[PDB]
């Protein structure tokens, strides 16, 4: 899931080229996978258009979880001299077949998550507890209001035990902890060998706590 126009799909001119050379780098990421595009550096004078692709010289992004099918996104790494060698990145946008298992504490009409809560629900002392039952390969996540803090701060790297304490987690994968929008994601392993329950908490002084609890059950995928 890298398009390296610097050393892999090389855009170096050849001697006495009459016409362009065009290279195609086609990617089929899964949702939330990281794509990297390398285009240009100190020595290699290449530009990427548009400068950030999916809204040395290097860009990475991850495709968000979406239920709206989209046409591929293209971006162009250009080498000039008028002859232009161009690397064309095509990213097929994966679409989800159902909402992400988990909890959007910021809307009752989430674009992303299976369960949502309106501002009236999360407002005013009992916890709001949102429980998801997850199995092998499930994508899970939650979003808390931007004003809230999340405990533990690195939820999914660590989480709290329904029984014991903070536990460095279960081989969770593609962990995303986006503190800009207080949105957290990860993927259960393809093999879960033991039942595990854990939780993370969002809070804000004088507000109901928002509890995201996961019951991960023995399974195989």
PDB file of C-alpha atoms in Angstrom:
ATOM      1  CA  UNK A   1       0.000   0.000   0.000  1.00  0.00           C
ATOM      2  CA  UNK A   2       2.789   2.299  -1.001  1.00  0.00           C
ATOM      3  CA  UNK A   3       3.246   4.106  -4.296  1.00  0.00           C
ATOM      4  CA  UNK A   4       6.899   4.925  -4.469  1.00  0.00           C
ATOM      5  CA  UNK A   5       7.573   6.970  -7.611  1.00  0.00           C
ATOM      6  CA  UNK A   6      11.020   7.702  -6.273  1.00  0.00           C
ATOM      7  CA  UNK A   7      12.532   4.201  -6.295  1.00  0.00           C
ATOM      8  CA  UNK A   8       9.819   1.738  -7.313  1.00  0.00           C
ATOM      9  CA  UNK A   9       7.621   3.111 -10.135  1.00  0.00           C
ATOM     10  CA  UNK A  10      10.548   5.215 -11.243  1.00  0.00           C
ATOM     11  CA  UNK A  11       9.776   8.419 -13.206  1.00  0.00           C
ATOM     12  CA  UNK A  12      13.372   9.178 -14.166  1.00  0.00           C
ATOM     13  CA  UNK A  13      13.582  10.290 -17.767  1.00  0.00           C
ATOM     14  CA  UNK A  14      15.423   8.181 -20.314  1.00  0.00           C
ATOM     15  CA  UNK A  15      17.852   9.577 -22.864  1.00  0.00           C
ATOM     16  CA  UNK A  16      16.185  11.148 -25.921  1.00  0.00           C
ATOM     17  CA  UNK A  17      12.623  10.286 -24.842  1.00  0.00           C
ATOM     18  CA  UNK A  18      10.215  11.325 -27.597  1.00  0.00           C
ATOM     19  CA  UNK A  19       7.065  11.077 -25.497  1.00  0.00           C
ATOM     20  CA  UNK A  20       5.866  10.561 -21.882  1.00  0.00           C
ATOM     21  CA  UNK A  21       6.281   7.498 -19.722  1.00  0.00           C
ATOM     22  CA  UNK A  22       3.240   6.833 -17.551  1.00  0.00           C
ATOM     23  CA  UNK A  23       3.245   4.516 -14.619  1.00  0.00           C
ATOM     24  CA  UNK A  24       0.176   3.238 -12.842  1.00  0.00           C
ATOM     25  CA  UNK A  25      -0.005   2.377  -9.168  1.00  0.00           C
ATOM     26  CA  UNK A  26      -3.384   0.924  -8.246  1.00  0.00           C
ATOM     27  CA  UNK A  27      -4.314   0.438  -4.593  1.00  0.00           C
ATOM     28  CA  UNK A  28      -7.198  -1.409  -2.999  1.00  0.00           C
ATOM     29  CA  UNK A  29      -6.916  -0.510   0.745  1.00  0.00           C
ATOM     30  CA  UNK A  30      -9.332  -1.823   3.334  1.00  0.00           C
ATOM     31  CA  UNK A  31     -11.153   0.756   5.426  1.00  0.00           C
ATOM     32  CA  UNK A  32      -8.729   2.672   7.730  1.00  0.00           C
ATOM     33  CA  UNK A  33      -5.664   1.152   6.118  1.00  0.00           C
ATOM     34  CA  UNK A  34      -2.677   3.399   5.703  1.00  0.00           C
ATOM     35  CA  UNK A  35      -1.634   4.396   2.215  1.00  0.00           C
ATOM     36  CA  UNK A  36       1.666   6.057   1.551  1.00  0.00           C
ATOM     37  CA  UNK A  37       2.692   7.905  -1.554  1.00  0.00           C
ATOM     38  CA  UNK A  38       6.328   8.872  -2.088  1.00  0.00           C
ATOM     39  CA  UNK A  39       6.808  11.452  -4.825  1.00  0.00           C
ATOM     40  CA  UNK A  40       9.887  13.647  -5.054  1.00  0.00           C
ATOM     41  CA  UNK A  41      12.730  14.432  -2.655  1.00  0.00           C
ATOM     42  CA  UNK A  42      15.907  16.494  -2.224  1.00  0.00           C
ATOM     43  CA  UNK A  43      17.378  15.155  -5.533  1.00  0.00           C
ATOM     44  CA  UNK A  44      14.291  13.861  -7.366  1.00  0.00           C
ATOM     45  CA  UNK A  45      12.347  16.902  -8.460  1.00  0.00           C
ATOM     46  CA  UNK A  46       8.802  15.508  -8.656  1.00  0.00           C
ATOM     47  CA  UNK A  47       5.516  17.180  -7.655  1.00  0.00           C
ATOM     48  CA  UNK A  48       2.293  15.494  -6.472  1.00  0.00           C
ATOM     49  CA  UNK A  49      -1.123  16.714  -7.691  1.00  0.00           C
ATOM     50  CA  UNK A  50      -3.168  17.536  -5.873  1.00  0.00           C
ATOM     51  CA  UNK A  51      -0.486  18.308  -3.326  1.00  0.00           C
ATOM     52  CA  UNK A  52      -2.110  16.095  -0.687  1.00  0.00           C
ATOM     53  CA  UNK A  53      -3.644  13.368  -2.957  1.00  0.00           C
ATOM     54  CA  UNK A  54      -6.673  12.318  -0.860  1.00  0.00           C
ATOM     55  CA  UNK A  55      -7.567  15.656   0.746  1.00  0.00           C
ATOM     56  CA  UNK A  56      11.401  12.649   1.219  1.00  0.00           C
ATOM     57  CA  UNK A  57       8.308  14.428  -0.188  1.00  0.00           C
ATOM     58  CA  UNK A  58       5.754  11.982   1.257  1.00  0.00           C
ATOM     59  CA  UNK A  59       2.056  11.676   2.127  1.00  0.00           C
ATOM     60  CA  UNK A  60       0.064   9.190   4.159  1.00  0.00           C
ATOM     61  CA  UNK A  61      -3.630   9.037   4.873  1.00  0.00           C
ATOM     62  CA  UNK A  62      -6.192   6.470   5.775  1.00  0.00           C
ATOM     63  CA  UNK A  63      -9.538   5.944   4.178  1.00  0.00           C
ATOM     64  CA  UNK A  64     -12.280   6.594   6.733  1.00  0.00           C
ATOM     65  CA  UNK A  65     -15.089   4.112   7.415  1.00  0.00           C
ATOM     66  CA  UNK A  66     -17.841   4.993   4.934  1.00  0.00           C
ATOM     67  CA  UNK A  67     -21.156   3.481   3.801  1.00  0.00           C
ATOM     68  CA  UNK A  68     -21.356   5.636   0.646  1.00  0.00           C
ATOM     69  CA  UNK A  69     -19.803   3.986  -2.438  1.00  0.00           C
ATOM     70  CA  UNK A  70     -17.374   6.348  -4.192  1.00  0.00           C
ATOM     71  CA  UNK A  71     -15.517   6.416  -7.502  1.00  0.00           C
ATOM     72  CA  UNK A  72     -11.768   5.906  -7.313  1.00  0.00           C
ATOM     73  CA  UNK A  73      -9.566   8.768  -6.258  1.00  0.00           C
ATOM     74  CA  UNK A  74      -6.664   9.630  -8.524  1.00  0.00           C
ATOM     75  CA  UNK A  75      -3.572  11.638  -7.928  1.00  0.00           C
ATOM     76  CA  UNK A  76      -0.603  12.437 -10.167  1.00  0.00           C
ATOM     77  CA  UNK A  77       3.132  12.451  -9.412  1.00  0.00           C
ATOM     78  CA  UNK A  78       4.706  14.496 -12.208  1.00  0.00           C
ATOM     79  CA  UNK A  79       8.252  14.727 -13.587  1.00  0.00           C
ATOM     80  CA  UNK A  80       8.792  17.489 -16.204  1.00  0.00           C
ATOM     81  CA  UNK A  81      11.371  18.577 -18.808  1.00  0.00           C
ATOM     82  CA  UNK A  82       7.173  19.580 -22.816  1.00  0.00           C
ATOM     83  CA  UNK A  83       7.510  15.972 -21.773  1.00  0.00           C
ATOM     84  CA  UNK A  84       6.087  14.743 -18.502  1.00  0.00           C
ATOM     85  CA  UNK A  85       6.512  11.321 -16.969  1.00  0.00           C
ATOM     86  CA  UNK A  86       3.637  10.708 -14.657  1.00  0.00           C
ATOM     87  CA  UNK A  87       2.819   8.270 -11.962  1.00  0.00           C
ATOM     88  CA  UNK A  88      -0.938   7.884 -11.620  1.00  0.00           C
ATOM     89  CA  UNK A  89      -2.186   6.678  -8.287  1.00  0.00           C
ATOM     90  CA  UNK A  90      -5.596   5.054  -8.355  1.00  0.00           C
ATOM     91  CA  UNK A  91      -7.159   4.355  -4.971  1.00  0.00           C
ATOM     92  CA  UNK A  92     -10.272   2.223  -5.041  1.00  0.00           C
ATOM     93  CA  UNK A  93     -12.372   3.425  -2.149  1.00  0.00           C
ATOM     94  CA  UNK A  94     -13.633   0.541  -0.037  1.00  0.00           C
ATOM     95  CA  UNK A  95     -17.182   0.880   1.248  1.00  0.00           C
ATOM     96  CA  UNK A  96     -18.503  -0.858   4.328  1.00  0.00           C
ATOM     97  CA  UNK A  97     -21.389  -3.321   4.200  1.00  0.00           C
ATOM     98  CA  UNK A  98     -22.647  -2.293   7.639  1.00  0.00           C
ATOM     99  CA  UNK A  99     -21.989   0.458  10.240  1.00  0.00           C
ATOM    100  CA  UNK A 100     -18.851   0.127  12.412  1.00  0.00           C
ATOM    101  CA  UNK A 101     -19.683  -1.803  15.516  1.00  0.00           C
ATOM    102  CA  UNK A 102     -19.627   0.732  18.353  1.00  0.00           C
ATOM    103  CA  UNK A 103     -20.798   3.989  19.643  1.00  0.00           C
ATOM    104  CA  UNK A 104     -21.130   7.571  18.397  1.00  0.00           C
ATOM    105  CA  UNK A 105     -21.643   9.684  21.461  1.00  0.00           C
ATOM    106  CA  UNK A 106     -21.986  12.811  19.259  1.00  0.00           C
ATOM    107  CA  UNK A 107     -25.146  11.946  17.244  1.00  0.00           C
ATOM    108  CA  UNK A 108     -28.176   9.707  17.268  1.00  0.00           C
ATOM    109  CA  UNK A 109     -27.737   9.511  13.439  1.00  0.00           C
ATOM    110  CA  UNK A 110     -24.137   8.461  12.994  1.00  0.00           C
ATOM    111  CA  UNK A 111     -22.701   8.178   9.507  1.00  0.00           C
ATOM    112  CA  UNK A 112     -20.139   5.680  10.880  1.00  0.00           C
ATOM    113  CA  UNK A 113     -21.216   3.800  14.009  1.00  0.00           C
ATOM    114  CA  UNK A 114     -23.876   1.182  14.741  1.00  0.00           C
ATOM    115  CA  UNK A 115     -25.230   2.926  17.871  1.00  0.00           C
ATOM    116  CA  UNK A 116     -25.642   6.681  18.421  1.00  0.00           C
ATOM    117  CA  UNK A 117     -26.786   8.997  21.256  1.00  0.00           C
ATOM    118  CA  UNK A 118     -28.296  12.461  20.885  1.00  0.00           C
ATOM    119  CA  UNK A 119     -27.170  15.465  22.933  1.00  0.00           C
ATOM    120  CA  UNK A 120     -30.293  15.045  25.076  1.00  0.00           C
ATOM    121  CA  UNK A 121     -29.342  11.517  25.995  1.00  0.00           C
ATOM    122  CA  UNK A 122     -25.794  12.259  27.074  1.00  0.00           C
ATOM    123  CA  UNK A 123     -26.882  15.328  29.089  1.00  0.00           C
ATOM    124  CA  UNK A 124     -28.495  15.715  32.538  1.00  0.00           C
ATOM    125  CA  UNK A 125     -26.107  10.807  36.990  1.00  0.00           C
ATOM    126  CA  UNK A 126     -25.853   7.146  35.861  1.00  0.00           C
ATOM    127  CA  UNK A 127     -23.306   6.322  33.135  1.00  0.00           C
ATOM    128  CA  UNK A 128     -24.313   6.046  29.487  1.00  0.00           C
ATOM    129  CA  UNK A 129     -22.901   2.550  28.767  1.00  0.00           C
ATOM    130  CA  UNK A 130     -22.657   1.426  25.171  1.00  0.00           C
ATOM    131  CA  UNK A 131     -21.742  -2.246  24.867  1.00  0.00           C
ATOM    132  CA  UNK A 132     -20.618  -3.947  21.675  1.00  0.00           C
ATOM    133  CA  UNK A 133     -20.114  -7.700  21.224  1.00  0.00           C
ATOM    134  CA  UNK A 134     -17.262  -8.241  18.893  1.00  0.00           C
ATOM    135  CA  UNK A 135     -15.721 -11.265  17.210  1.00  0.00           C
ATOM    136  CA  UNK A 136     -12.780 -12.090  14.948  1.00  0.00           C
ATOM    137  CA  UNK A 137     -11.839  -9.453  12.437  1.00  0.00           C
ATOM    138  CA  UNK A 138     -14.554  -7.037  13.606  1.00  0.00           C
ATOM    139  CA  UNK A 139     -13.826  -3.357  13.163  1.00  0.00           C
ATOM    140  CA  UNK A 140     -14.943  -1.532  16.331  1.00  0.00           C
ATOM    141  CA  UNK A 141     -14.760   2.098  17.503  1.00  0.00           C
ATOM    142  CA  UNK A 142     -16.349   5.087  19.183  1.00  0.00           C
ATOM    143  CA  UNK A 143     -16.512   8.863  19.012  1.00  0.00           C
ATOM    144  CA  UNK A 144     -16.856  11.098  22.035  1.00  0.00           C
ATOM    145  CA  UNK A 145     -17.694  14.802  22.078  1.00  0.00           C
ATOM    146  CA  UNK A 146     -14.614  16.906  21.278  1.00  0.00           C
ATOM    147  CA  UNK A 147     -14.729  18.522  24.734  1.00  0.00           C
ATOM    148  CA  UNK A 148     -14.381  15.236  26.632  1.00  0.00           C
ATOM    149  CA  UNK A 149     -11.271  13.467  27.734  1.00  0.00           C
ATOM    150  CA  UNK A 150     -10.788   9.753  27.135  1.00  0.00           C
ATOM    151  CA  UNK A 151      -9.473   7.349  29.740  1.00  0.00           C
ATOM    152  CA  UNK A 152      -7.109   5.781  29.295  1.00  0.00           C
ATOM    153  CA  UNK A 153      -5.854   8.425  26.839  1.00  0.00           C
ATOM    154  CA  UNK A 154      -4.452   5.726  24.550  1.00  0.00           C
ATOM    155  CA  UNK A 155      -7.622   3.643  24.456  1.00  0.00           C
ATOM    156  CA  UNK A 156      -7.187   0.390  22.473  1.00  0.00           C
ATOM    157  CA  UNK A 157      -3.422   0.331  23.127  1.00  0.00           C
ATOM    158  CA  UNK A 158      -4.466   0.086  26.723  1.00  0.00           C
ATOM    159  CA  UNK A 159      -8.024  -0.345  28.116  1.00  0.00           C
ATOM    160  CA  UNK A 160      -9.620  -0.989  31.473  1.00  0.00           C
ATOM    161  CA  UNK A 161     -10.569  -4.491  32.699  1.00  0.00           C
ATOM    162  CA  UNK A 162     -14.214  -5.036  33.643  1.00  0.00           C
ATOM    163  CA  UNK A 163     -12.622  -7.162  36.385  1.00  0.00           C
ATOM    164  CA  UNK A 164      -9.077  -5.856  37.131  1.00  0.00           C
ATOM    165  CA  UNK A 165      -7.272  -2.705  35.882  1.00  0.00           C
ATOM    166  CA  UNK A 166      -5.464  -0.994  33.027  1.00  0.00           C
ATOM    167  CA  UNK A 167      -4.207  -3.670  30.718  1.00  0.00           C
ATOM    168  CA  UNK A 168      -2.050  -3.320  27.687  1.00  0.00           C
ATOM    169  CA  UNK A 169      -4.396  -5.106  25.323  1.00  0.00           C
ATOM    170  CA  UNK A 170      -5.671  -9.020  22.546  1.00  0.00           C
ATOM    171  CA  UNK A 171      -3.747  -8.329  19.317  1.00  0.00           C
ATOM    172  CA  UNK A 172      -5.849  -5.324  18.199  1.00  0.00           C
ATOM    173  CA  UNK A 173      -4.881  -4.093  14.736  1.00  0.00           C
ATOM    174  CA  UNK A 174      -5.135  -0.868  12.732  1.00  0.00           C
ATOM    175  CA  UNK A 175      -5.552   1.087  16.024  1.00  0.00           C
ATOM    176  CA  UNK A 176      -6.507   4.697  15.376  1.00  0.00           C
ATOM    177  CA  UNK A 177      -6.593   7.229  18.171  1.00  0.00           C
ATOM    178  CA  UNK A 178      -7.683  10.497  16.586  1.00  0.00           C
ATOM    179  CA  UNK A 179      -7.653  13.137  19.302  1.00  0.00           C
ATOM    180  CA  UNK A 180      -8.647  15.885  16.835  1.00  0.00           C
ATOM    181  CA  UNK A 181     -12.155  14.433  16.620  1.00  0.00           C
ATOM    182  CA  UNK A 182     -12.011  12.103  19.643  1.00  0.00           C
ATOM    183  CA  UNK A 183     -12.578   9.147  17.314  1.00  0.00           C
ATOM    184  CA  UNK A 184     -11.077   5.765  18.088  1.00  0.00           C
ATOM    185  CA  UNK A 185     -10.959   2.598  15.937  1.00  0.00           C
ATOM    186  CA  UNK A 186      -9.341  -0.776  15.906  1.00  0.00           C
ATOM    187  CA  UNK A 187      -9.818  -4.250  14.470  1.00  0.00           C
ATOM    188  CA  UNK A 188     -10.148  -7.480  16.440  1.00  0.00           C
ATOM    189  CA  UNK A 189      -7.616 -10.169  15.456  1.00  0.00           C
ATOM    190  CA  UNK A 190      -8.640 -12.915  12.975  1.00  0.00           C
ATOM    191  CA  UNK A 191      -8.272 -15.249  15.956  1.00  0.00           C
ATOM    192  CA  UNK A 192      -9.739 -14.552  19.442  1.00  0.00           C
ATOM    193  CA  UNK A 193      -8.837 -17.367  21.857  1.00  0.00           C
ATOM    194  CA  UNK A 194     -10.175 -16.125  25.162  1.00  0.00           C
ATOM    195  CA  UNK A 195     -13.241 -14.036  26.160  1.00  0.00           C
ATOM    196  CA  UNK A 196     -12.146 -10.574  27.080  1.00  0.00           C
ATOM    197  CA  UNK A 197     -14.133  -7.585  28.251  1.00  0.00           C
ATOM    198  CA  UNK A 198     -12.638  -4.157  28.410  1.00  0.00           C
ATOM    199  CA  UNK A 199     -13.786  -0.543  28.443  1.00  0.00           C
ATOM    200  CA  UNK A 200     -12.676   3.051  27.982  1.00  0.00           C
ATOM    201  CA  UNK A 201     -14.406   6.128  29.425  1.00  0.00           C
ATOM    202  CA  UNK A 202     -15.106   9.605  28.080  1.00  0.00           C
ATOM    203  CA  UNK A 203     -15.775  12.385  30.516  1.00  0.00           C
ATOM    204  CA  UNK A 204     -16.230  16.074  31.144  1.00  0.00           C
ATOM    205  CA  UNK A 205     -16.755  17.724  34.514  1.00  0.00           C
ATOM    206  CA  UNK A 206     -20.366  17.613  35.649  1.00  0.00           C
ATOM    207  CA  UNK A 207     -21.493  15.402  32.743  1.00  0.00           C
ATOM    208  CA  UNK A 208     -22.608  11.778  32.667  1.00  0.00           C
ATOM    209  CA  UNK A 209     -19.618   9.504  31.950  1.00  0.00           C
ATOM    210  CA  UNK A 210     -19.756   7.837  28.549  1.00  0.00           C
ATOM    211  CA  UNK A 211     -18.626   4.197  28.777  1.00  0.00           C
ATOM    212  CA  UNK A 212     -17.611   2.212  25.709  1.00  0.00           C
ATOM    213  CA  UNK A 213     -17.499  -1.485  26.645  1.00  0.00           C
ATOM    214  CA  UNK A 214     -16.447  -4.326  24.422  1.00  0.00           C
ATOM    215  CA  UNK A 215     -17.157  -8.030  24.947  1.00  0.00           C
ATOM    216  CA  UNK A 216     -14.798  -9.874  22.629  1.00  0.00           C
ATOM    217  CA  UNK A 217     -15.796 -13.514  22.234  1.00  0.00           C
ATOM    218  CA  UNK A 218     -13.848 -16.640  21.317  1.00  0.00           C
ATOM    219  CA  UNK A 219     -13.886 -16.906  17.517  1.00  0.00           C
ATOM    220  CA  UNK A 220     -12.098 -17.519  14.243  1.00  0.00           C
ATOM    221  CA  UNK A 221     -11.980 -15.739  10.854  1.00  0.00           C
TER     222      UNK A 221
END
